[PDB]
Amino acid sequence: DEAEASKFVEEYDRTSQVVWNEYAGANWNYNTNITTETSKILLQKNMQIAQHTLKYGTQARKFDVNQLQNTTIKRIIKKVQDLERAALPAQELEEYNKILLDMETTYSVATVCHPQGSCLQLEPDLTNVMATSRKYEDLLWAWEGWRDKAGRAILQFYPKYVELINQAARLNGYVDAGDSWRSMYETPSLEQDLERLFQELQPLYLNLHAYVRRALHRHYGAQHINLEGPIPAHLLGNMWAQTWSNIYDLVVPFPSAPSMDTTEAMLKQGWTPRRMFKEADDFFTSLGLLPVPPEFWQKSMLEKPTDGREVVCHASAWDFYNGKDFRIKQCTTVNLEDLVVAHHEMGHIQYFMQYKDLPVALREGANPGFHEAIGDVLALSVSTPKHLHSLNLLSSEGGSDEHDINFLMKMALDKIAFIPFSYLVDQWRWRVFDGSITKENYNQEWWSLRLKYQGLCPPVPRTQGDFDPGAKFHIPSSVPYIRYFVSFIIQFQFHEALCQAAGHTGPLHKCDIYQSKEAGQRLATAMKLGFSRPWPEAMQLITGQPQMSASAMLSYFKPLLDWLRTENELHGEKLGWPQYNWTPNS
Ligand SMILES: *[C@@H]1O[C@H](CO[C@@H]2O[C@@H](C)[C@@H](O)[C@@H](O)[C@@H]2O)[C@@H](O[C@@H]2O[C@H](CO)[C@@H](O[C@@H]3O[C@H](CO)[C@@H](O)[C@H](O)[C@@H]3O)[C@H](O)[C@H]2NC(C)=O)[C@H](O)[C@H]1NC(C)=O
Ligand SMILES: CCCC[C@H](N[C@@H](CCc1ccccc1)C(=O)O)C(=O)N[C@@H](Cc1c[nH]c2ccccc12)C(=O)O
Ligand SMILES: *[C@@H]1O[C@H](CO)[C@@H](O)[C@H](O)[C@H]1NC(C)=O
Ligand SMILES: [Cl-]
Ligand SMILES: [Cl-]
Ligand SMILES: [Zn+2]
To answer: What is the effect of changing residue 376 to E/A?
Structure first.
């Protein structure tokens, strides 16, 4: 009985490595070379992997997991009973795979064109406009144009995508696809836990929002910013207003303590995409963690091709399921923002290497948030002014209270601003999946949440036919989002714990764990667990306790909360957006 189940897991593990490696190869070849031929091969490998999933999943379902004594085998077999899309009938499975490919291709090849002028891709062209233009109409052109071309083009697919992903979820024992996705956390209290964490971050976010709103009023004019209303969504330096640090120049707390232009410093010093990834690899090995293998450097795509290939630019990390071949695909630009992205992606690679010897079913993060958090933890140390000065990308900024508050503001514009964005994406999709948002009101309900959680309004009133969620990568690519909310909370818990393990004293935001072997050992022991244990065990190995908590993030930013409250009170700011119905008049 126990013996047949053990044998089954061994056979599943052997055969899964082969077929998933072939799938990953076809998927990579399409993502790095969008053509009719690579698309056709990819759809064929989709059917091959479904045949495997159906064979082994059907077997797994013949086991009564209740009667298995070994808890590791029990856990693997329970997981393999979920066929995901391979539960669908063949005709629906083919339709679903084609819909997914059509949606992700539509996003990745969309362009926005000037009349009898040039056509801009999202990366680098439109993202550069959003980051650097300080002209309301130019930002509006890029913001609206991207939604018109990418978002509107996904709408034709999304209702059928929803029907099919939900159908597969029901065939695997869930009530809808959002139930299935939430199950990855194995935490019955997930929704309440996330809401409580969101509420703890409100003082910081509301104060940041009011301060930034005032600064935008100063630059863009009183006729275009309502000091008691939501902020227009195209003014925050980022296409989705999900991180705001590119408008640091407009909001700097102490302009008499300026920072060196880090993009120009990186360019003058000869930085390249490969150098950026080499620096990330060096930070990981300084903690005693694993270097990426030589193969990574030969096979990764670390910059946009110049040879005519169309590619999926959106950065991502790839496991080829053979314990040897790991790769990053990123259209890297030489700037500080993308150095942080490089660390994020190298954190995924680290996790892949740490859990490579577990059974494939257990080769995941402790929960999806943990997978997202590893690289960001190291990037918190890289981002310190002390570390950036050691890279010759900032001047010496220490010993200055003004530089200290400036740094905390730079960090808040990304980390605090992202909290409400990362909360709302799957609040929307969970309600699409459970049927309480229909295609009649996709876009209206999206904007209701953008208002409620982020305090943003669209600069141009939306019209029927708009599908602004489709203009965000994870929606057409069907990548869950609450992982990023979880990550941004727990990365500060991990930073706090690793800094204490490294012997740091003083304010958390001054900590840099470079070269700490004690810090590396904490992370390594947790990552080696993969998905073999409930995630509170990995939380315990890193932090010494088992809960998710916003306390670390709040501690990191405490000096900035104090500064923001004093500043906002001086100016008479009304926190929030009680005039929540305000929208731009022109
Ligand atoms: C329940 O079963 C798990 C899994 O057992 C493993 O997978 C099965 C499908 C069979 O193939 C088994 O033969 C196989 O061991 C047991 O977990 C395993 O325990 C062993 C011994 O404690 C671990 O061995 C280690 O292996 C590494 C190399 O990977 C060595 O460096 C170590 O020195 C040590 O020998 C093994 O890692 C572990 N495997 C997993 C996936 O956790 C588990 O012990 C068992 N439970 C009980 C109560 O018996
Ligand atoms: C353009 C960079 C995208 C990076 C990332 N890319 C994903 C691809 C995942 C995937 C899975 C399956 C198939 C294909 C792809 C990843 O590695 O998790 C991403 O999406 N980050 C989020 C949040 C974020 C913004 N800024 C950051 C800075 C640091 C850390 C996180 C974020 C975002 O951009 O919204
Ligand atoms: C892109 O795909 C086509 C079609 O399969 C192939 O002929 C070509 O060699 C590929 N290009 C690269 C750079 O791999
Ligand atoms: Cl939007
Ligand atoms: Cl998730
Ligand atoms: Zn990630």
So the answer is: Decreased dipeptidyl carboxypeptidase activity
**Six-digit token string for 307:** 């040879």
> Could you tell me which of 347, 367, 384, 383 has the C-alpha nearest to residue 534?
367
52 is in an annotated binding site: no
Question: Is 297 labelled as part of a ligand binding site?
Answer: no
Residue type, 533: R
15 burial (CB, 10 Å; 0-12 / 13-18 / 19+) is middle
Q: Is 9 in the pocket of ligand 1 (CB under 6 A)?
A: yes
Distance CA 194, CA 432 (A): 19
Residue ranges of the domains in the chain? 2-572
- Evaluate the omega torsion of the peptide bond into residue 258 and state whether it is cis, within 30 degrees of 0: no
The reply to whether 483 sits in an annotated binding site is yes
Please write down the long-range contacts of 254-260, taking CB distance under 8 Å and 24 or more positions apart: 254/402, 254/403, 254/405, 254/406, 256/402, 257/397, 257/400, 257/402, 257/403, 257/406, 259/394, 259/395, 259/397, 259/403, 259/406, 259/410, 260/393, 260/394, 260/395
CA–CA separation, 49 vs 303, rounded Å? 30
User: Binding site annotation covers 147?
Assistant: yes
Q: Provide the sign of the torsion angle of the four alpha carbons 466, 472, 475, 481, taken in this order.
A: negative
Of 568, 215, 253, the residue nearest 405 (C-alpha) = 253
Contacts of 399 (CB under 8 A, 6+ apart): none
Write the residue with the smallest CA distance to atom 7 of ligand 3.
37
Measured from the Cα of 472, ligand 2's closest atom is: 35
Two tokens, residue 378: 């190291």
What the block records as the tokens of 400 is 């200055």
What contacts 24+ positions apart, CB below 8 Å, involve 208-212? 208/412, 208/413, 208/416, 208/417, 208/564, 209/455, 209/575, 209/576, 210/568, 210/573, 210/574, 210/575, 210/576, 211/251, 211/564, 211/567, 211/568, 211/573, 212/236, 212/244, 212/247, 212/251, 212/413
CA-to-CA distance for 355 and 18, rounded, in angstroms? 17
Alpha carbon of 402 to those of 257, 386, 398, 554: distances in Å? Answer: 6, 15, 10, 20
Taking the centre of ligand 1 as the mean of its atom positions, its distance from the CA of residue 511, in whole angstroms, is 38
Beta bridge partners of 319: 326
Q: Is 340 in the pocket of ligand 2 (CB under 6 A)?
A: yes
Residue 362 CB–ligand 2 contact under 6 Å = no
Ligand nearest to the CA of 36: 3
Distance CA 274, CA 323 (A): 23
Method used to obtain the model? X-ray
Residue 479 Cβ inside 6 Å of ligand 2? The answer reads yes
SS3 119: strand
Q: How far apart are CA 60 and CA 335, in angstroms?
A: 48
List the catalytic residues: 345, 474
Residues with CB under 5 A from ligand 6 (ion): 372
505 exposed, middle or buried (CB, 10 Å; 0-12, 13-18, 19+)? Answer: exposed
